[PDB]
Amino acid sequence: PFGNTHNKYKLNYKSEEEYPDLSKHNNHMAKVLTPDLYKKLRDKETPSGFTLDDVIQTGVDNPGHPFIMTVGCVAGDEESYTVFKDLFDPIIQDRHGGFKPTDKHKTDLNHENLKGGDDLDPHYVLSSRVRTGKSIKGYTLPPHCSRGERRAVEKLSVEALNSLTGEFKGKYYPLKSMTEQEQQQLIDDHFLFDKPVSPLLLASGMARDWPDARGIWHNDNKSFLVWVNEEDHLRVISMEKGGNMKEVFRRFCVGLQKIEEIFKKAGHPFMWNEHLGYVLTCPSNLGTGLRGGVHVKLAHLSKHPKFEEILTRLRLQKRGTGGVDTAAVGSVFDISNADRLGSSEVEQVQLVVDGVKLMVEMEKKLEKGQSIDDMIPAQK
Amino acid sequence: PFGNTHNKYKLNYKSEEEYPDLSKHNNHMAKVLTPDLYKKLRDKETPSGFTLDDVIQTGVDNPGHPFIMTVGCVAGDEESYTVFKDLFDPIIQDRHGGFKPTDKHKTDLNHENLKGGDDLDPHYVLSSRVRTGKSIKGYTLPPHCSRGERRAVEKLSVEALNSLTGEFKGKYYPLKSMTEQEQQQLIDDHFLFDKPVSPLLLASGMARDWPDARGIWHNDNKSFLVWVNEEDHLRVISMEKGGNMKEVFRRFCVGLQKIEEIFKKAGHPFMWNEHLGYVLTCPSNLGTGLRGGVHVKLAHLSKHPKFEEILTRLRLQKRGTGGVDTAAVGSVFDISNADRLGSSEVEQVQLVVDGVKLMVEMEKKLEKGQSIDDMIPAQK
Ligand SMILES: Nc1ncnc2c1ncn2[C@@H]1O[C@H](COP(=O)(O)OP(=O)(O)O)[C@@H](O)[C@H]1O
Ligand SMILES: Nc1ncnc2c1ncn2[C@@H]1O[C@H](COP(=O)(O)OP(=O)(O)O)[C@@H](O)[C@H]1O
Ligand SMILES: CN(CC(=O)O)C(N)N
Ligand SMILES: [Mg+2]
Ligand SMILES: [Mg+2]
């Protein structure tokens, strides 16, 4: 029982007979997979039984489209990254600016190392936010995890979160028993998540048993939010209105370390290693898993020839006002760090603080009508 | 499905820790599963590694359906129906209107014994269709089949179908070779299976690797078609405009017999036993696998307070114009026999002809300002 009968059954076919048809594909996985790599890795399994087929399924199912390259693969556990390193390493190097198999990732959650960021001009910066994801050692990741493992993650997380006090006193809302009123309240506060609709996620198996053992915790102040068992075991978000990113990041680090110490005592620390930093399902999110950002009104700078170039130079990214696929209603852009792996949490938020400060100074010159042609920084 | 099929850590959790939460689920699986059944069968697997969790996943994920009552489980191979018989048999009994473990599949080949059905009123009955499914013995079914297995089924099936002659002369059209426009036209014209959007198809693992090794075979005038590797290895279809169900059924039965003769001669017989008849993925499609029905315009009858009761009395199922996952458009309903095991093809098509003729007579009475109170049919 509970063995490898399934993969052994597939191994009755030759490697070419099981090899995916990637002729229409444009994703990182398809860029790297070869007939030889598939042949060499198809009989391998992690201790939990995760296989190369499981790693690549989403990339097989979702070819991609013209420009933006999707990753096209997932990890099912920490071991996936080692057992299938011959696939993941080139993907990680390509996705994360050349990060090599021998490179090390530096973690830094000491919020005191951030400099400034309490001052971001409220007239332009409408809100500040820091998000990360975390995995819990001892449990496989959402593509793979059993109902039993998922429930164990939820129990540990909820008991931990229920123990928090002061600024971090809060309450958990299971998706399965959520009242209509609770759901509406969470929507009003931009705290709700629903079953994923993205085929990139659905194709990996991560949505099984929905909504079993999924839920949302937030503190009474509505400034610290935790999603349980969505894309990763945990998603942890600190947010508030205005431009005190210093306070947002402080709260983020303190709450994250409080949770960490409880998990560590239970023998289930956050999944982490010196090479990849914090381990998560998607290779794109390794390292810090961190997206620190602001909603910032850039009426003129938005409509400027070098706007996309300035973001690139500052190592920043932009999205709409309502998320990843939105058109920035009014003039409000979601600006955040582009980096994840090979730089620390402090370094990434510092880039956001420093970069957003410069871009507000730039916009102030533009609304007067001065030239933005000297403040343009070197590529960071 | 997915990696979770072979998650080796399920061993490490208690049965009650892995047991699904089926509270407020309304499908046949959830009506039957118990803690004891789960405990008994959770450590079992078929020779290809299909497990109880794979059987039930769609019924966990899909508590209900917007249009019909669903079975909530699938088979992954022939052996599924034996290994997990204690779950399947009560579901089959419920779904097929009382078919007991001691009852036997029925067929004759006597399609000419259909009484009437050559003259369904074409003002109401816009098209007539008869389908069934077949599985190739020795290959796993769509929820579980590997890319290699699926490809093997496609290769042998196309070779066999290409040997059809006479009114059944046709050819194969691989899904990957169709343009978006060509695919959409075939779907709009009701010939080709939809994009992989069914909650059953998705949740159970049947959409993996799409569109690899899927396609449609058909004769030149598209009156006789075979889908390859959608929900079943084969779906054999006869259809045409208008109300000559007898002719549709003639073509179906003669064609199906030619197919099975060809497959047997090639050494690729279908999955079959004396109890369940022909074995297919969904328990609802066992026995003859036959779903015979019409697109019928019921503007008045569909608004009558006893519409659903009448359908139940007649043992007919209602679906949308674009099939099970769609709504009726322009009051055009897909009306077909609900049950497939414990009766023959002729009995099934006779039940459709008789029921549809009654419903058309009801529609006509309601159009004329008369009532149908006196015409409600006895429970079949
Ligand atoms: N700086 C911000 N201020 C307020 N809300 C934000 C901010 N950044 C993101 N959001 C909100 O969080 C949601 C998720 O955004 P999304 O781009 O998916 O973010 P992430 O991937 O970090 O979760 C959106 O609905 C959006 O309204
Ligand atoms: N009587 C009919 N006439 C024309 N098309 C039909 C008829 N019945 C079903 N269909 C079509 O068959 C396709 C599949 O519908 P679906 O509900 O999935 O049925 P099946 O049991 O064959 O899988 C749909 O495109 C639908 O419009
Ligand atoms: C709609 N189905 C029946 C069911 O889900 O019970 C099919 N496709 N087997
Ligand atoms: Mg997001
Ligand atoms: Mg169908």
Coordinates of N, CA and C in Angstrom, one line a residue, chain B residues 51-194:
Chain B
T51 N -6.5 4.7 -6.9 CA -6.9 4.6 -5.4 C -8.3 5.1 -5.2
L52 N -8.7 4.9 -4.0 CA -10.1 5.3 -3.5 C -10.2 6.9 -3.6
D53 N -9.1 7.6 -3.2 CA -9.1 9.0 -3.3 C -9.3 9.5 -4.7
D54 N -8.6 8.8 -5.7 CA -8.9 9.1 -7.1 C -10.3 8.9 -7.6
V55 N -10.9 7.7 -7.1 CA -12.2 7.4 -7.5 C -13.2 8.6 -7.1
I56 N -13.0 9.1 -5.8 CA -14.0 10.0 -5.3 C -13.7 11.5 -5.4
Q57 N -12.5 11.9 -6.0 CA -12.1 13.3 -6.0 C -13.1 14.2 -6.6
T58 N -13.8 13.9 -7.7 CA -14.7 14.8 -8.3 C -15.9 15.0 -7.4
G59 N -16.4 14.0 -6.7 CA -17.5 14.2 -5.8 C -17.2 14.9 -4.5
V60 N -15.9 15.0 -4.2 CA -15.5 15.8 -3.1 C -15.4 17.3 -3.5
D61 N -14.8 17.5 -4.7 CA -14.7 18.8 -5.3 C -16.0 19.5 -5.7
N62 N -16.9 18.6 -6.2 CA -18.2 19.1 -6.8 C -19.3 18.6 -6.0
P63 N -19.7 19.4 -5.0 CA -20.8 19.1 -4.1 C -22.2 18.9 -4.8
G64 N -22.3 19.7 -5.9 CA -23.5 19.6 -6.7 C -23.2 20.0 -8.1
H65 N -24.2 20.3 -8.9 CA -24.1 20.7 -10.3 C -25.2 21.6 -10.6
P66 N -25.1 22.6 -11.4 CA -26.2 23.6 -11.7 C -27.4 23.0 -12.5
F67 N -27.2 21.8 -13.1 CA -28.3 21.3 -14.0 C -28.7 19.9 -13.7
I68 N -27.8 19.0 -13.3 CA -28.2 17.6 -13.1 C -27.7 17.1 -11.7
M69 N -28.2 16.0 -11.3 CA -27.7 15.2 -10.2 C -26.5 14.4 -10.8
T70 N -25.4 14.5 -10.1 CA -24.1 13.9 -10.5 C -23.7 12.6 -9.6
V71 N -22.9 11.8 -10.3 CA -22.5 10.5 -9.6 C -21.4 10.8 -8.6
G72 N -20.5 11.7 -8.8 CA -19.5 12.1 -7.8 C -18.3 11.1 -7.7
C73 N -18.1 10.2 -8.7 CA -16.9 9.4 -8.7 C -16.7 8.8 -10.1
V74 N -15.5 8.3 -10.3 CA -15.1 7.7 -11.6 C -14.2 6.5 -11.4
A75 N -14.2 5.7 -12.4 CA -13.3 4.6 -12.5 C -12.0 5.0 -13.3
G76 N -10.9 4.5 -12.9 CA -9.6 4.8 -13.6 C -9.1 3.6 -14.5
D77 N -9.8 2.5 -14.4 CA -9.4 1.3 -15.1 C -10.5 0.3 -14.9
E78 N -10.5 -0.9 -15.6 CA -11.5 -1.9 -15.4 C -11.6 -2.4 -14.0
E79 N -10.4 -2.6 -13.4 CA -10.3 -3.2 -12.0 C -10.9 -2.3 -11.0
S80 N -11.0 -1.0 -11.2 CA -11.7 -0.1 -10.3 C -13.0 -0.6 -9.8
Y81 N -13.8 -1.1 -10.7 CA -15.2 -1.5 -10.4 C -15.2 -2.8 -9.5
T82 N -14.1 -3.5 -9.5 CA -14.0 -4.7 -8.6 C -13.3 -4.3 -7.2
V83 N -12.2 -3.7 -7.3 CA -11.5 -3.3 -6.1 C -12.3 -2.4 -5.2
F84 N -13.1 -1.5 -5.8 CA -13.9 -0.5 -5.0 C -15.4 -0.8 -5.2
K85 N -15.7 -2.1 -5.4 CA -17.1 -2.5 -5.6 C -18.1 -2.1 -4.5
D86 N -17.6 -2.1 -3.3 CA -18.5 -1.8 -2.1 C -18.9 -0.4 -2.2
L87 N -18.2 0.5 -2.8 CA -18.6 1.9 -3.0 C -19.4 2.0 -4.3
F88 N -18.9 1.5 -5.4 CA -19.6 1.6 -6.7 C -21.0 0.9 -6.8
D89 N -21.1 -0.3 -6.2 CA -22.3 -1.0 -6.4 C -23.6 -0.3 -5.9
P90 N -23.6 0.2 -4.7 CA -24.7 1.0 -4.2 C -25.0 2.3 -5.0
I91 N -23.9 2.9 -5.5 CA -24.1 4.1 -6.4 C -24.8 3.7 -7.7
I92 N -24.3 2.6 -8.3 CA -24.9 2.1 -9.6 C -26.3 1.8 -9.3
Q93 N -26.6 1.1 -8.2 CA -28.0 0.8 -7.9 C -28.9 2.0 -7.8
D94 N -28.4 3.0 -7.1 CA -29.1 4.3 -7.0 C -29.3 5.0 -8.3
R95 N -28.2 5.1 -9.0 CA -28.1 5.9 -10.3 C -29.0 5.3 -11.4
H96 N -29.1 4.0 -11.5 CA -29.8 3.4 -12.6 C -31.2 2.9 -12.2
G97 N -31.7 3.4 -11.1 CA -33.1 3.1 -10.8 C -33.4 1.8 -10.2
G98 N -32.4 1.3 -9.4 CA -32.6 0.0 -8.7 C -31.9 -1.2 -9.2
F99 N -30.8 -1.0 -10.0 CA -30.1 -2.1 -10.6 C -29.2 -2.8 -9.5
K100 N -29.6 -4.0 -9.1 CA -29.0 -4.7 -8.0 C -27.7 -5.4 -8.4
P101 N -26.8 -5.7 -7.4 CA -25.6 -6.5 -7.7 C -25.9 -7.9 -8.3
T102 N -27.1 -8.4 -8.0 CA -27.6 -9.7 -8.6 C -28.2 -9.6 -9.9
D103 N -28.5 -8.3 -10.4 CA -29.1 -8.1 -11.7 C -28.0 -8.2 -12.8
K104 N -28.4 -8.4 -14.0 CA -27.5 -8.5 -15.1 C -27.7 -7.5 -16.2
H105 N -26.7 -7.1 -16.9 CA -26.7 -6.3 -18.1 C -27.6 -7.0 -19.1
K106 N -28.4 -6.2 -19.9 CA -29.2 -6.7 -21.0 C -28.8 -6.1 -22.3
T107 N -28.6 -6.9 -23.3 CA -28.7 -6.4 -24.7 C -29.3 -7.4 -25.6
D108 N -30.0 -6.9 -26.5 CA -30.2 -7.5 -27.8 C -29.5 -6.6 -28.8
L109 N -29.6 -7.1 -30.1 CA -29.1 -6.3 -31.2 C -30.3 -5.9 -32.1
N110 N -31.5 -6.1 -31.6 CA -32.7 -6.0 -32.4 C -33.3 -4.5 -32.6
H111 N -32.4 -3.7 -33.2 CA -32.8 -2.3 -33.3 C -34.1 -2.1 -34.1
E112 N -34.4 -3.0 -35.0 CA -35.6 -2.9 -35.8 C -36.9 -3.0 -35.0
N113 N -36.8 -3.5 -33.8 CA -38.0 -3.6 -32.9 C -38.5 -2.3 -32.3
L114 N -37.8 -1.2 -32.5 CA -38.3 0.1 -32.1 C -39.6 0.3 -32.8
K115 N -40.6 0.7 -32.0 CA -42.0 1.0 -32.5 C -42.1 2.5 -32.6
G116 N -42.4 2.9 -33.8 CA -42.5 4.3 -34.1 C -41.2 5.0 -34.0
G117 N -41.2 6.3 -33.8 CA -39.9 7.0 -33.6 C -39.3 7.5 -34.9
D118 N -39.9 7.2 -36.1 CA -39.5 7.6 -37.4 C -40.1 9.0 -37.7
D119 N -41.0 9.5 -36.9 CA -41.9 10.6 -37.2 C -42.1 11.6 -36.1
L120 N -41.1 11.8 -35.2 CA -41.2 12.8 -34.2 C -41.3 14.2 -34.9
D121 N -42.3 15.0 -34.4 CA -42.7 16.2 -35.1 C -41.5 17.2 -35.2
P122 N -41.0 17.5 -36.4 CA -39.8 18.3 -36.6 C -40.0 19.8 -36.3
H123 N -41.3 20.2 -36.0 CA -41.5 21.5 -35.5 C -41.0 21.7 -34.1
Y124 N -40.9 20.6 -33.4 CA -40.5 20.6 -32.0 C -39.1 19.9 -31.8
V125 N -39.0 18.7 -32.5 CA -37.8 17.9 -32.4 C -36.9 18.4 -33.5
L126 N -35.9 19.2 -33.1 CA -34.9 19.8 -34.1 C -33.8 18.9 -34.5
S127 N -33.5 17.9 -33.7 CA -32.4 17.0 -34.0 C -32.5 15.8 -33.1
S128 N -32.0 14.7 -33.6 CA -32.0 13.4 -32.9 C -30.6 12.8 -32.8
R129 N -30.2 12.3 -31.7 CA -28.9 11.8 -31.5 C -28.9 10.5 -30.6
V130 N -28.0 9.6 -30.9 CA -27.8 8.4 -30.0 C -26.3 8.3 -29.9
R131 N -25.8 8.2 -28.6 CA -24.4 7.9 -28.4 C -24.2 6.8 -27.4
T132 N -23.0 6.2 -27.4 CA -22.5 5.4 -26.4 C -21.0 5.6 -26.3
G133 N -20.4 4.9 -25.3 CA -19.0 4.9 -25.1 C -18.4 3.5 -25.1
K134 N -17.2 3.3 -25.5 CA -16.4 2.1 -25.3 C -15.1 2.3 -24.7
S135 N -14.6 1.4 -23.9 CA -13.2 1.4 -23.4 C -12.5 0.2 -24.0
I136 N -11.2 0.5 -24.4 CA -10.3 -0.6 -24.9 C -9.8 -1.4 -23.7
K137 N -10.1 -2.7 -23.7 CA -9.6 -3.6 -22.6 C -8.1 -3.5 -22.6
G138 N -7.6 -3.5 -21.3 CA -6.2 -3.4 -21.1 C -5.5 -2.1 -21.0
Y139 N -6.3 -1.0 -21.1 CA -5.8 0.4 -21.0 C -6.6 1.1 -19.9
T140 N -5.9 2.0 -19.2 CA -6.5 2.8 -18.1 C -7.4 3.9 -18.8
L141 N -8.4 4.3 -18.0 CA -9.4 5.3 -18.5 C -8.9 6.7 -18.3
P142 N -9.6 7.6 -19.0 CA -9.2 9.1 -19.0 C -8.8 9.8 -17.7
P143 N -9.5 9.4 -16.5 CA -9.0 10.1 -15.3 C -7.6 9.8 -14.9
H144 N -7.0 8.7 -15.4 CA -5.8 8.1 -14.9 C -4.7 7.8 -16.0
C145 N -5.2 7.8 -17.2 CA -4.3 7.3 -18.3 C -3.1 8.3 -18.5
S146 N -1.9 7.7 -18.6 CA -0.7 8.5 -18.9 C -0.7 9.0 -20.3
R147 N 0.1 10.0 -20.7 CA 0.3 10.4 -22.0 C 0.5 9.2 -23.0
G148 N 1.4 8.3 -22.6 CA 1.7 7.1 -23.4 C 0.5 6.2 -23.6
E149 N -0.3 6.0 -22.6 CA -1.4 5.1 -22.6 C -2.5 5.7 -23.5
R150 N -2.7 7.0 -23.4 CA -3.7 7.8 -24.2 C -3.3 7.7 -25.7
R151 N -2.0 7.9 -25.9 CA -1.5 7.8 -27.3 C -1.7 6.4 -27.9
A152 N -1.4 5.4 -27.1 CA -1.6 4.0 -27.5 C -3.1 3.8 -27.9
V153 N -4.0 4.3 -27.1 CA -5.4 4.1 -27.4 C -5.8 4.8 -28.7
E154 N -5.3 6.0 -28.9 CA -5.5 6.8 -30.1 C -5.0 6.1 -31.3
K155 N -3.8 5.7 -31.3 CA -3.2 5.0 -32.4 C -4.0 3.8 -32.9
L156 N -4.3 2.9 -32.0 CA -5.1 1.6 -32.3 C -6.5 1.9 -32.7
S157 N -7.1 3.0 -32.1 CA -8.5 3.3 -32.4 C -8.6 3.9 -33.8
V158 N -7.7 4.8 -34.2 CA -7.8 5.4 -35.5 C -7.5 4.4 -36.6
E159 N -6.6 3.5 -36.4 CA -6.3 2.5 -37.3 C -7.5 1.6 -37.6
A160 N -8.2 1.2 -36.5 CA -9.4 0.5 -36.6 C -10.5 1.2 -37.3
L161 N -10.8 2.4 -36.9 CA -11.9 3.2 -37.4 C -11.7 3.5 -38.9
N162 N -10.4 3.7 -39.3 CA -10.2 4.0 -40.7 C -10.5 2.8 -41.6
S163 N -10.8 1.6 -41.1 CA -11.2 0.5 -41.9 C -12.7 0.4 -42.1
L164 N -13.5 1.2 -41.5 CA -14.9 1.3 -41.7 C -15.2 1.7 -43.2
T165 N -16.2 1.1 -43.8 CA -16.5 1.4 -45.2 C -18.0 1.7 -45.4
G166 N -18.4 1.9 -46.6 CA -19.8 2.1 -46.9 C -20.3 3.4 -46.3
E167 N -21.5 3.3 -45.7 CA -22.1 4.5 -45.1 C -21.2 5.0 -43.9
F168 N -20.3 4.2 -43.4 CA -19.5 4.5 -42.3 C -18.1 4.9 -42.7
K169 N -17.8 5.0 -44.0 CA -16.5 5.5 -44.4 C -16.2 6.9 -43.9
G170 N -15.0 7.1 -43.3 CA -14.7 8.4 -42.7 C -13.2 8.6 -42.6
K171 N -12.8 9.5 -41.6 CA -11.4 9.7 -41.3 C -11.3 10.5 -40.1
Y172 N -10.1 10.6 -39.6 CA -9.8 11.2 -38.3 C -9.3 12.6 -38.5
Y173 N -9.7 13.4 -37.5 CA -9.3 14.8 -37.4 C -8.7 15.1 -36.0
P174 N -7.4 15.0 -35.8 CA -6.8 15.3 -34.5 C -7.1 16.7 -34.0
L175 N -7.4 16.8 -32.7 CA -7.7 18.1 -32.1 C -6.6 19.1 -32.3
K176 N -5.4 18.6 -32.1 CA -4.2 19.6 -32.2 C -4.1 20.2 -33.6
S177 N -4.6 19.5 -34.6 CA -4.5 20.0 -36.0 C -5.6 20.9 -36.4
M178 N -6.6 21.1 -35.6 CA -7.7 22.0 -35.9 C -7.4 23.4 -35.5
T179 N -7.8 24.4 -36.3 CA -7.7 25.8 -35.9 C -8.8 26.0 -34.9
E180 N -8.6 27.1 -34.1 CA -9.6 27.6 -33.1 C -11.0 27.7 -33.8
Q181 N -11.0 28.3 -35.0 CA -12.3 28.5 -35.7 C -12.9 27.1 -36.1
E182 N -12.1 26.2 -36.6 CA -12.7 24.9 -36.9 C -13.2 24.2 -35.7
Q183 N -12.5 24.2 -34.6 CA -13.0 23.5 -33.4 C -14.3 24.2 -32.9
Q184 N -14.3 25.5 -32.9 CA -15.5 26.2 -32.4 C -16.7 25.9 -33.3
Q185 N -16.5 25.8 -34.6 CA -17.6 25.5 -35.5 C -18.2 24.1 -35.2
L186 N -17.3 23.2 -35.0 CA -17.7 21.8 -34.7 C -18.5 21.7 -33.4
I187 N -18.1 22.5 -32.4 CA -18.7 22.5 -31.1 C -20.1 23.2 -31.2
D188 N -20.1 24.4 -31.9 CA -21.4 25.1 -32.1 C -22.4 24.3 -32.9
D189 N -22.0 23.5 -33.8 CA -22.8 22.6 -34.6 C -23.1 21.3 -33.9
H190 N -22.7 21.2 -32.6 CA -23.1 20.1 -31.7 C -22.4 18.7 -32.0
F191 N -21.4 18.7 -32.9 CA -20.7 17.5 -33.3 C -19.5 17.1 -32.4
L192 N -18.7 18.1 -32.0 CA -17.5 17.9 -31.3 C -17.6 18.3 -29.8
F193 N -17.0 17.5 -29.0 CA -16.9 17.7 -27.5 C -16.3 19.1 -27.3
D194 N -16.8 19.7 -26.1 CA -16.4 21.1 -25.8 C -14.9 21.2 -25.4

